Symmetry: C2
């Protein structure tokens, strides 16, 4: 399709994923934006992917879509099947990826607020537990902090699946070629240039300094196999979070933990949710 | 057309032409390149646009295509008609703008060597006078120096039409909006994203330090009208070259000197050529 995808393919071929993500971030400043949560063009209505049991007061799980330009509403499909008959699971879209092409958020807080309003409509009064994978894990925690402080609705918990926060990103930078190759392997259609610009823009959002820590307890779910090669002498390659409530290790790598081994992730989540309520 | 064009249009509207030319330069690093003049994909066969009188040892004019993404083989068409029955006029393409998409040069010297070899073939035994406008004027001079220094064959002269070399570009920045608007106004079809990356790549080449100075005599041709508003207390808005052999002023501004007033440009060239030989 478009030139950004062709350039990005070349960048991954030449092992320069990070350099090209910076180009996408810079280019993204020239796309139409939205600066107030109200100015948002898309409907961020969460999609119900699994139903809980017929009852009460139980937490609903909200999946926070990650930044992958090849992603979208299919991200949590495999995982959600293990929640059927256990928990409601809602998937909330990320602003800037839809349709027409969606406006990009002016800053992260503008996108988080538009998500927070959509989640509060769909969840009604049930307690909310957020879940995210990789960059979606970072976004789930930033959203949890936004719901606390700007919307007076603190979530009951956060599930961070393989997060690599600023200061602990080194292994995911070393494996950046595998991230890029996984984006192309995961194409169900050619990544549009609009979505690659969204991906670059959110990546830069989530690299910045964001000191707030949510008060909600954190479940840290970690892959057990490394995504690529790794020298023992470089230390621990694993995902990381500061002071998690619970830590769970599941089979698979950064990618296959949410595919072939998604049931192991679901079981860690379900046990944790029962414990904390 | 493509996303780069739409981004560029937005950048011009927001008075950010220069910042977006930098995004194009950075992005252009991920296009396939050629590193040897042999490895150049397209053939740089110079096109004969006007023929001189049939007789000897008269110089032929070589038009050095400029950097504008909206340019190409039409650039010298109205200028060349005034050379018919006076001087051979050849237009040499600029590598990376053609065709399958054209390979970009690894550095400016690589592209200049490719042009140098096509020109030496096409000109045969005739002395050569190089001519260029705006960014093409900077390229004409760099080509003149390459021919003298690396190929041992200095041209008989250089015609620089409205050059703004590094160190003398304050008007080019003050008028950046008008330059961007003149690019879109000059479109005969939509600027392709490949040509926009070519333009950004050559613009960065021409911003870098290039110390070599040609020993060929220079005709400096300047526009007489300012392209935009300019407080004369700043200094001179006009085009500049150090130690020109001759200076000629022609009607029109930076753009209209070459369309509406090309005959005035041609007449200054033809009179200068007779003088130096």
């Amino acid at each position: 399709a478009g030139m950004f995808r062709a350039l990005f393919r070349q960048a991954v071929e030449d092992d320069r994923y990070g350099e090209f993500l910076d180009v996408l971030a810079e280019a993204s400043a020239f796309r139409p934006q939205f600066a107030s949560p109200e100015a948002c063009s898309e409907r961020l209505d969460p999609v119900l992917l699994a139903g809980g049991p017929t009852d009460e007061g139980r937490a609903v799980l909200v999946g926070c879509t990650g930044t992958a330009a090849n992603g979208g509403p299919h991200e949590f499909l495999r995982l959600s099947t293990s929640f059927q008959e256990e928990r409601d699971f809602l998937a909330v879209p990320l602003p800037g990826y839809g349709t027409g092409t969606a406006l990009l958020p002016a800053d992260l807080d503008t996108a988080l607020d538009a998500q927070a309003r959509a989640i509060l409509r769909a969840a009604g009064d049930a307690p909310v537990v957020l879940l995210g994978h990789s960059g979606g894990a970072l976004l789930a925690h930033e959203l949890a902090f936004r719901l606390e402080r700007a919307h007076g609705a603190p979530p009951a918990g956060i599930v961070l699946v393989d997060p690599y926060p600023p200061g602990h990103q080194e292994p995911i930078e070393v494996w950046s070629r595998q991230l890029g190759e996984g984006l192309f392997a995961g194409e169900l259609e050619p990544m549009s240039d609009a979505r690659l610009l969204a991906m670059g823009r959110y990546a830069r959002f989530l690299a910045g300094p964001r000191p707030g820590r949510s008060s909600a307890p954190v479940l840290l779910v970690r892959a057990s196999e490394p995504l690529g090669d790794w020298q023992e002498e470089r230390g621990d390659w694993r995902a990381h979070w500061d002071l998690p409530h619970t830590v769970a290790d599941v089979p698979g790598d950064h990618f296959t933990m949410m595919r072939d081994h998604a049931p192991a992730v679901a079981e860690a989540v379900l046990s944790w949710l029962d414990a904390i309520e």
